[PDB]
Amino acid sequence: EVQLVQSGAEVKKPGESLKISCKGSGYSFTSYWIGWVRQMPGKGLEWMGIIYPGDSDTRYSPSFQGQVTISADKSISTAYLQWSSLKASDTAMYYCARPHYYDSLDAFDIWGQGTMVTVSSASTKGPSVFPLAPTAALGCLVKDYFPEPVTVSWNSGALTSGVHTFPAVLQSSGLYSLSSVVTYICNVNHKPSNTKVDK
Amino acid sequence: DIQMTQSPSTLSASVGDRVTITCRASQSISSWLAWYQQRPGKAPKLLIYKASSLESGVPSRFSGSGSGTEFTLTISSLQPDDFATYYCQHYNSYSPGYTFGQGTKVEIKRTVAAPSVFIFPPSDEQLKSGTASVVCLLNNFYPREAKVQWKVDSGNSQESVTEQDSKDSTYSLSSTLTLSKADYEKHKVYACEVTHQGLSSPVTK
């Protein structure tokens, strides 16, 4: 069982420091490079850089050079991606990955599950839920919340057919909004703010 | 810029098709090329390395070929699992350089379906708090491309698309019209106009 396991989701404000982890298991960690890959939301994969845990030999993609620190603690098989001053634009899924062969910079065959990092100057806020009133359709507008995610069920799980809950859009306010479409009750759960609104 | 370019950006295919996806390198790179798959949410998975070597476990209907500057990934018979996004990647070993292509999304081909269109005015509640949100719903349509035209008797609307409904292969879209109350109370009759090739001419409601 060769794995890379990554630390939990992070929500931060710009300026704050952050250090996320990638832990290897089921193989000799000091023997393989570790890479980091960025994926911005709705975007594709970006190589950020790579480190050799044996001696922390480190290389950066020229665009990320001086913009993020990669390190490793080989005694505990953990690699790290580190920012001393997060930007809004740092908001992304971060993946660690391992080359297929030892002491080599080959294609990545082991990947961690990913660490979502949200950097925003917004603060935790529960959503307002508005009915979308009237084969016919209707829904709820789950407006102005931070951070992701919200869960929207209908009739406490009974009603699932016709149900389309859409990706949140990020408003210029820094707050999220989504619609769930299928007055009569939608159950919206936002756990960051402990908000729970049956509408 | 060593740059890797993929085409098409989107590929519409059916279960059973032989499909081929292209990668081009801005300069010759021998066989130092890998292919990756990614599903929504999931982490990328390695399929091919050295242009044409299959990773263990990866189904044999996958193959890669090419050398120098043009590379291809082929699925001899597309299966429901293969609907996903694919990336290529130049790597070395010698000295660190990884470069991804921008991705190709393989999606289920379907007959053209017009969107059912519905529009919702703001609620009473919202109408007290400071803003109006008119939502236009474009429901169960194909293909993915649709143009939403907000009419008020811009840059004040946002859009969101469902992933392909995998029992139907359709998309659904939501547009949110956000103004204050009164850009809202000044004006009276509202309208959402929708272009999509499943419809002769733009429909409005």
Author numbering:
A (entry chain H): 1 to 9, 11 to 30, 35 to 59, 62 to 72, 74 to 111, 112A, 112 to 141, 150 to 197, ...
B (entry chain L): 1 to 29, 36 to 57, 65 to 72, 74 to 80, 83 to 110, 113 to 171, 176 to 227
What do the study authors state?
Antibodies to the autoantigen transglutaminase 2 (TG2) are a hallmark of celiac disease. We have studied the interaction between TG2 and an anti-TG2 antibody (679-14-E06) derived from a single gut IgA plasma cell of a celiac disease patient. The antibody recognizes one of four identified epitopes targeted by antibodies of plasma cells of the disease lesion. Epitope 1 is a major epitope as 30 of 57 monoclonal antibodies derived from single TG2-reactive plasma cells were found to be epitope 1-specific.
The binding interface was identified by small angle x-ray scattering, ab initio and rigid body modeling using the known crystal structure of TG2 and the crystal structure of the antibody Fab fragment, which was solved at 2.4 Å resolution. The Fab fragment displays a conventional immunoglobulin fold characterized by an anti-parallel β-sheet sandwich architecture with CDR loops forming the presumed antigen binding site. The electron density is well defined for most residues in the CDR loops except for Tyr-109 in the CDR-H3 and Tyr-110 and Ser-113 in the CDR-L3, reflecting the flexibility of the CDR3 loops. Despite intensive effort, co-crystallization trials of the Fab fragment of 679-14-E06 with various forms of TG2 were unsuccessful. However, we succeeded in solving the structure of the antibody Fab fragment by x-ray crystallography, and we studied the interaction of the Fab fragment with TG2-GDP by small angle x-ray scattering (SAXS). Molecular dynamics simulations suggest interactions of 679-14-E06 with the N-terminal domain of TG2 via the CDR2 and CDR3 loops of the heavy chain and the CDR2 loop of the light chain. In addition there were contacts of the framework 3 region of the heavy chain with the catalytic domain of TG2. As to details of the interactions with CDR loops, the model suggests that Glu-8 of TG2 forms a salt bridge with Lys-56 of CDR-L2, that Lys-30 of TG2 forms a salt bridge with Asp-111 of CDR-H3, and that Arg-116 of TG2 forms salt bridges with residues Asp-62 and Asp-64 of CDR-H2. By testing in ELISA, neither of the hybrid antibodies (i.e. 679-14-E06H/679-14-A04L or 679-14-A04H/679-14-E06L) bound TG2 as compared with the efficient binding by the 679-14-E06H/679-14-E06L antibody. This suggests that residues of both the heavy and the light chain of 679-14-E06 are involved in recognition of epitope 1. TG2 residues Arg-116 and His-134 were identified to be critical for binding of 679-14-E06 as well as other epitope 1 antibodies.
